[PDB]
Curated annotation (Swiss-Prot), chain B:
Listed name of the protein: 4-aminobenzoate N-oxygenase
Gene (UniProt): aurF
Result when mutating residue 204 to A: Loss of activity
UniProt remark on cofactor binding: Contains a nonheme dinuclear iron cluster that stabilizes a peroxo intermediate. Was originally suggested to contain a binuclear manganese cluster or a heterodinuclear manganese/iron cluster.
Residues annotated as binding Fe cation 1: 78, 113, 116, 200
Keyword tRNA processing assigned: no
Phenotype when the gene is knocked out: Deletion of the gene abolishes both N-oxidation activity and aureothin production.
Provenance organism: Streptomyces thioluteus
Similarity annotation: Belongs to the AurF N-oxygenase family.
């Protein structure tokens, strides 16, 4: 079997966030209210005159809101997109998925996603308590999940729905959110915010390598119509993860009471790193068969 | 907020198997094939004449099968019974489940169950490799799960189905498998077999405490007709976890080639219900539940 997979399975105890920082709760120990929740430098409208025209506490409420929103979207992605793909592999629904090495690598990833959900859930609860955020509008559906559900809606056959779910999860796990990596390195924000994202990023880098190996092995064992289906679905999943939907920004800005929120939003790097998914496409020998313009590899 | 829930949440990093023995895979290192997989002492037909009249390799193959069978059932219980109940709580379908202390304790439990599945899956894989078992017959559907399907068939509405799933999960997590506890303490079997079960039991002791606290809190917030279904639901789940089904024994004796397997099973390990009894008290359902709780086992 895959030496990459063997190596990833062996490294998991030395690498995983759940093993090496299970005590994340205690990181709020000596909290400092004076330190921001989110870095202004990665806010796209940070220097828009209408955002600058606001009062300092209003800008701070937007930053806090964007931090909470980012954590909400991470949890929804894990729960609705990434974990269901991992679960399908473990269920043995694809030929070749009964392999001990595939099963070990993916079950480890499932433990990691559980702990990721734990960390991000903690981040929301602690922030809401400490910032005294009593109430907050029930946020919109993920654009990525909306696309998934619409693809699946009129699909007759379970075998094809399984392919779509796998591909959506695979793309999610190989296309790293710019906010994950930018938040991870940021020294200006709450140290627990930088830390949680640092931990998640370390695990996600391994998850992308696992997904590349696992998808190669399963595609190789798939029949032609399964293979064909995987191929059609890739560009659709890739475009869903490339698509920016700034509905969340509008709600945050309106929440904070910033005047001209519609103007600021309507007025509008932060691209995902698609390196992993490009490697995935390469490993499948699909380097000319996928209709997607891959963005440049980010500096970070 | 519950002081028990609070203590268990803050102790989780020190307690959790996932933190303490993530490298469980490496425990197979200096592997000794001479050490049995499973203790004869706890095999219900160990002293049956037809079992004793089989060859040494045949009896050792049964022990291997029962160990693998144990692990298969643990995984199935976690996947089909325990995790769904915990997920239901996290999906906030019940009033009062949005509480951050409840969410922390249950999410930590969910991390634990994913790691338990991992441990048990690898015990199966490492045993099958080292003992050279190339094929194993399809296993029977869990008795507990078969009974679950039945109740859900009888109670088909979405809101009914949530309550049944929760109770099924709750009973599973508060009634400790005799085999879990007896394997954990066994000094004669493969050290990693007693280790995995020791680790799982340590976690499960906490989970039982968690479930009693959570279910109580969720009980307070249900409407008349939800409470109704939960109270009527408890004894059926409890009966399900108490009913002893012999079908998996008859399969190990065949997988091993033992003659008169039917007679053996014809001629034929009660859970510790202590945690579930407490759950019943905590709900004030002491007089309401028609179920006869067995005496606590010494272990």
């Amino acid at each position: 079997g895959s030496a990459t997979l063997g190596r990833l399975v062996r490294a998991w105890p030395r690498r995983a966030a759940v093993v090496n920082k299970a005590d994340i709760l205690d990181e709020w120990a000596d909290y400092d209210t004076l330190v921001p929740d989110y870095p202004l430098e990665i806010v796209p409208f940070a220097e828009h005159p209408l955002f600058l025209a606001a009062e300092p506490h209003q800008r701070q409420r937007v930053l806090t809101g964007m931090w909470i929103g980012y954590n909400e979207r991470v949890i929804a992605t894990e729960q609705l997109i990434a974990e269901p793909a991992f679960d399908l592999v473990m269920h043995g629904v694809f030929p070749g998925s009964d392999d001990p090495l595939i099963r070990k690598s993916v079950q480890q990833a499932i433990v990691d996603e559980s702990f990721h959900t734990y960390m991000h859930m903690l981040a929301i609860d602690r922030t809401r308590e400490l910032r005294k955020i009593s109430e907050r509008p029930p946020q919109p559906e993920l654009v990525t999940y909306r696309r998934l559900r619409r693809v699946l809606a009129d699909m007759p056959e379970q075998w094809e729905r399984d392919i779509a779910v796998l591909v959506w999860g695979a793309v999610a796990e190989t296309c790293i959110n710019a906010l994950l990596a930018l938040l991870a390195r940021d020294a200006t924000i709450q140290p627990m915010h930088s830390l949680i994202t640092t931990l998640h990023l370390r695990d996600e880098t391994a998850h992308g390598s696992i997904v590349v190996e696992v998808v190669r092995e399963l595609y190789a064992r798939m029949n032609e119509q399964q293979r064909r289906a995987l191929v059609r679905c890739l560009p659709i999943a890739l475009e869903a993860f490339a698509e920016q939907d700034l509905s969340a920004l509008l709600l945050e800005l309106n929440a904070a009471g910033i005047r001209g929120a519609e103007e600021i939003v309507g007025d509008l790097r932060l691209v995902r790193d698609f390196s992993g998914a490009r490697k995935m496409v390469e490993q499948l020998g699909l380097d000319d068969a996928v209709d997607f313009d891959f963005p440049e590899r980010p500096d970070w």
